[PDB]
Symmetry: C3
Subunit: 302 residues, 3 copies
């Protein structure tokens, strides 16, 4: 069998993503019913930069699959040497790293599945959790309208583009000039959207992006590695704040998503986070179920 990896959202076809999302709903209902790692078999969970929430969710999820997560947090060894030995110890490799080329290198030589837990360019597992949450609140994903606001070149904007159009969602990214999606990601999303009937829109007009939306999404304006980049990373993003005024422009039944943690008062307001349209708490919980589903699916296919 071909060893499958999940390094970016479009590594799953539309039909494969639907299978993983259906499995996430099944696992939420029956969380110890799938035990492919019974033994326990190991899963490596490796951090080039520590992420407590990522480690938390995978550590518990792997245990609930019957496995034992071995956490290695933040040189002496080539990536090829690491892939070779880990393939003897564990049944999958979950890795939080920086550049995408490193994930590609690991996945090219490892003989077990490699999962991008979180990287600079993509956050594929969080977007599976998002799609699971939208399906819970709204039903069918195909044809929904989703708008993301803020830094249009960060990992969530890229993954909402790719994962969203894979699900058949029309995705809009509202971002200031200078902060737009990577051209390669945008072109890949446009091509994938052709297969599903979705579309890709990029705009600097936050009000137009909010009008008619079914889902509004935002994220922190600045990652830790961007704090020293020299830019004023507040002034450009203020018009893109997800506040009550913006939300009132969307569909009456619109929901709001936000990868945690949120910086209340910056990209999102208290009234929105804590109001009836907020799905952020279900979204955070569903990271557990969606990651378990992804692991089960990759392991069975590999």
């Amino acid at each position: 069998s071909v060893i499958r990896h999940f390094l970016r959202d479009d590594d799953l076809s539309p039909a494969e993503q639907a299978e993983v999302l259906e499995l996430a709903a099944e696992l939420k209902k029956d969380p110890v019913s799938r035990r492919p790692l019974q033994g326990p078999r190991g899963v490596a969970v490796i951090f080039d930069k520590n992420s407590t929430r990522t480690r938390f969710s995978f550590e518990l999820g792997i245990a609930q699959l019957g496995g034992h997560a071995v956490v290695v947090d933040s040189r002496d060894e080539t990536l090829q040497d690491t892939a070779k030995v880990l393939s003897r110890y564990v049944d999958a490799i979950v890795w939080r790293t920086f550049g995408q080329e490193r994930l590609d290198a690991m996945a090219s030589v490892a003989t077990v599945p490699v999962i991008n837990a979180l990287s600079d360019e993509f956050h594929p597992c969080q977007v599976l959790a998002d799609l699971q949450t939208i399906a819970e609140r709204k039903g069918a994903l195909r044809g929904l309208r989703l708008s993301y606001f803020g830094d249009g070149a960060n990992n969530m904007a890229h993954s909402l583009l790719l994962g969203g159009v894979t699900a058949g969602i029309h995705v809009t990214v509202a971002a200031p000039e200078g902060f737009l999606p990577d051209p390669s990601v945008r072109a890949a999303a446009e091509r994938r959207a052709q297969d599903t009937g979705a579309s890709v829109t990029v705009t600097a007009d936050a009000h137009a992006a909010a009008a008619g939306a079914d889902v509004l999404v935002t994220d922190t304006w600045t990652s830790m590695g961007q704090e020293n980049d020299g830019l004023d990373r507040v002034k450009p993003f203020r018009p893109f704040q997800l506040n009550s005024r913006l939300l009132a422009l969307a569909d009456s039944d619109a929901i709001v998503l936000h990868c945690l943690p949120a910086h209340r008062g910056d990209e999102i307001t208290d009234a929105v986070m804590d109001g009836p349209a907020s799905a952020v708490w279900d979204e955070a919980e569903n990271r557990l179920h969606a990651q378990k589903a992804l692991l089960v699916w990759l392991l069975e296919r590999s």
Copy 2:
């Protein structure tokens, strides 16, 4: 109906008796209770690392069938209320080592799973449950025993021995020098609870009088900048004034030669090693009890 354990008197006398009985049952049959089978998660969070606390909780949770998710050294990148909401979706209880009591109260008022004070500046209520289990297995009934704590009367063990001790019906004496006495509000709460159980509260600077007739002698680390505590050293002369078959307690680590001597720590009155082991059983019992009530 979500019960928390932030300080010793969060359990009533009857509820404390239930937890202590459960701790004895779990010592006998350590994998017989599996409320966390799955595994279900328990968050174990440290604002300041404590290896011994982490060690005992991590193993005990595993023996309840659970998986402890340990977070070393909250409130860093998100509000405490946001943290409580999400944690309540991932785990069945929250074990937290933090400093001020206002942080514990804040987490407990929002979380919809039990919050346990693993160790704090003001109280050490899990360690006192382990002490009470140790006293009961060596002496039987707790009601009416005389317990004396020696040394720093302002620290968390003095407060918890006062509150947890009188909750069990024990007459508690704190022997301590002038600049290091119990917090007045803890003392008042312990005097109130002692009226319900027939116990009493005494605070004195006279170590000889506190040791005379004691059934349980307890001390703890003092931290010469420790001159005022040396008259309260738990040494062979003090122990010789106690009731026959008295026992000596000290939560670890102990600084031998400071607050306690080798002859007392390694002698026949010492229950320090059983006491350390019973932290495992008592914390498991607390978790089992809170989980079934919540």
Copy 3:
């Protein structure tokens, strides 16, 4: 009678054979032995961190049904806030075995002298005995019977691997040669213990500065890093003396034609070992890395049942 494993010759030749057979059985059936079902605890304590040591022990302990409690070096070093004797006393109430990475051998001795559960040396300044059990399992897999094989170690002859290959190798009946420059020779006490154990097994001990002679006719060639982290500031040029002892293709071609190459990880490609040797058909480094899991599980199962 509580058994410990602080150094390779803590097992007799017959006992070592039992552990190695158990390691082969556990490789075939990795969750069939559950002496720690419960879970029972095992303490895994690091005075200095070693990721690969923790990785392998943590997973192996879970596969025995247990739960590893890992205590890293950030925690106050054992001996500082508390005597080793007090620590052993309390750990004995919490866990069924103590796995400890520490420095001087006297600390291990003090711990095992009072603990009432088995104490295992995970890695120390003087010995690396669990790694050599993994090596012996790997050699047996590739070669069959260990008795009478010729094994040569190259590089720093006074580090923990050289000492454990001497003691563990002669316990298995292997003729062990250490090839090292003057000033980097095995500890005399270890060499004398190996020489004594060797006359029980038909083995032999050789120490030489001649790398070519040590490679000629060898069945197994082994090396390790020339410097550990604690030696980087010892004042010595730790490259120039070891260059003649590099495991490269020319050295390997002197050995027996079916010789195998071992190196515990990490390895520094280009220094003590070359890419061609690491990645060629004689290399057993990857199987060796994997067998750390099985050999450590076997050692724990054996010590727990014997105690």
